[PDB]
Hints:
Subcellular location (chain C): Nucleus
Order of helices and strands of chain C: EHEEHEEEEHEEEEEHE
Radius of gyration of chain C: 22 Å
Number of strands of chain A: 0
Number of helices of chain A: 12
Shape of chain C: elongated
Strand content of chain A: under 5%
GO molecular function, one term (chain C): cyclosporin A binding
Radius of gyration of chain A: 23 Å
Shape of chain A: elongated
InterPro entries (chain C): Cyclophilin-like_dom_sf, Cyclophilin-type_PPIase_CS, Cyclophilin-type_PPIase_dom, Nucleotide-bd_a/b_plait_sf, PPIE, PPIE_RRM, RBD_domain_sf, RRM_dom
Strand order of the largest sheet of chain C: 8-9-11-10-12-7-6-13
CATH superfamily of the domain at 5-82 in chain C: RRM (RNA recognition motif) domain
Largest sheet of chain C: 8 strands, antiparallel
Organism (chain C): Homo sapiens
Catalytic activity (chain C): [protein]-peptidylproline (omega=180) = [protein]-peptidylproline (omega=0)
Order of helices and strands of chain A: HHHHHHHHHHHH
Helix content of chain A: 55-70%
Helix content of chain C: 10-25%
CATH class of the domain at 5-82 in chain C: Alpha Beta
Oligomer: part of a larger assembly
CATH topology of the domain at 5-82 in chain C: Alpha-Beta Plaits
CATH architecture of the domain at 5-82 in chain C: 2-Layer Sandwich
Largest sheet of chain A: none
Structural class of chain C: alpha+beta
Amino acid sequence: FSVKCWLRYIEFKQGAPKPRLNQLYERALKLLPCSYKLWYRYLKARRAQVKHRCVTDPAYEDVNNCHERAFVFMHKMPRLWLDYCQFLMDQGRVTHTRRTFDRALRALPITQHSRIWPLYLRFLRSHPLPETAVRGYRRFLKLSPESAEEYIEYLKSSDRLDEAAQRLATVVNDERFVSKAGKSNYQLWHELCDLISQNPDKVQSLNVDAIIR
Amino acid sequence: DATVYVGGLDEKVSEPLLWELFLQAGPVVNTHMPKDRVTGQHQGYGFVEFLSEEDADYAIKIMNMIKLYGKPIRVNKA
Amino acid sequence: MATTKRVLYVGGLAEEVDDKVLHAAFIPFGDITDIQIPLDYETEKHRGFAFVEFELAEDAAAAIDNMNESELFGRTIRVNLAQVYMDIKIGNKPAGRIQMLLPMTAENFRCLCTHEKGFGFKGSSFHRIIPQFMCQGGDFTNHNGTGGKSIYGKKHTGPGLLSMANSGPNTNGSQFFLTCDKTDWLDGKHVVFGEVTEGLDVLRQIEAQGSKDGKPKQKVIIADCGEYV
């Protein structure tokens, strides 16, 4: 009934992640999704007290309890997954980011986009592969005009002009989206990038007239 | 105020639907609604003498609420 | 740097397209939240474009990519990132809002705008309209001339002034007029009590329905009224 006895009794469990793991997981699963906010406070206190023990197990217990207490989906569940992705943003392994974005991918609200794209920007360091995979997969899936624009701006900062011209070309396809922007122009901007190619870089006097044309 | 001037009427109206019409508000003691002799038809403006003045001032307040032949009826003191 | 990616700009609209047409079917999140369009005071006719707001930013961006160069009303529209009142209806058409600035005379008119005493102007007409002179109303349940009632019982320098109609000295009720020119021959005979602050153009649309004998060419109705408070 009253989940207050489940929160206090879940906090009174001694030992490591056992009674609170199974007792708190089954207790929150057998109750209504109401006190689950206090279960997230107890997940932050338990994650702070267990932060001194290894890495994985506390994050998997707190993330598993927060995801299990959220039932299917919710508004705050991708926010908590984005918080665990923020604390796990500096790791050294791609498993925390893969499971992070995988857990934040359950629904599709405006949230978790700023978690996913800068994750591909940080992973894009030292290799083009995650920028091309996550950029090409992000711009060609779901729906957004601005997703390919931000991914094109992040791809233009690299040393390769391909992904930038590939995103500008994919947005230059129009077809079922002539004015994909209204006042925002993804064409004249790419033409300004061609003007950046017209800068004193290639002196062969060939690609200049081709870029102007 | 005992009398009122009434404009904007249609000749199918006569002294009778004025009688009946304004006594709906309060009794018209003396009715005057000209009959023009020359072409035998009414221009549609009226003069009304009441019992005393109170009748006619209430008449100023309420009175401009009569619409004769879909059209507007002027009532003012005199 | 800005977060104003909610208000979308729609162009190439038709003469029939309005805030309503865009709402039930606009570019981004137009029909939702709030909508802005070029509306007159008497004409009340939209041009061809407008601005629609979306509850969120993502929804707006998706509406542009789509509505962009879409087909509406057999046309190609463009989408991209961007005191009392009386509402007047002339014939079957909204004309716009007149706003007026307004002690006993002002309080009477204020209460007749709000209906707080149980009766007032809403749904009544301007029954006598004379071009270059005045528009008279306030015969709420009368539609004649000096008909109606005050909140207390039964009883001019230029255009856009409010003044009390009457049937002689000390006979103010609910009937009033809005001046359409300097009407100084009424000075000392009618009590001026307010002025139009917005919507002089809507008053000019009322005047356009006048005749020399005062008979309105089309019905002019106070569709709604109230106070800013």
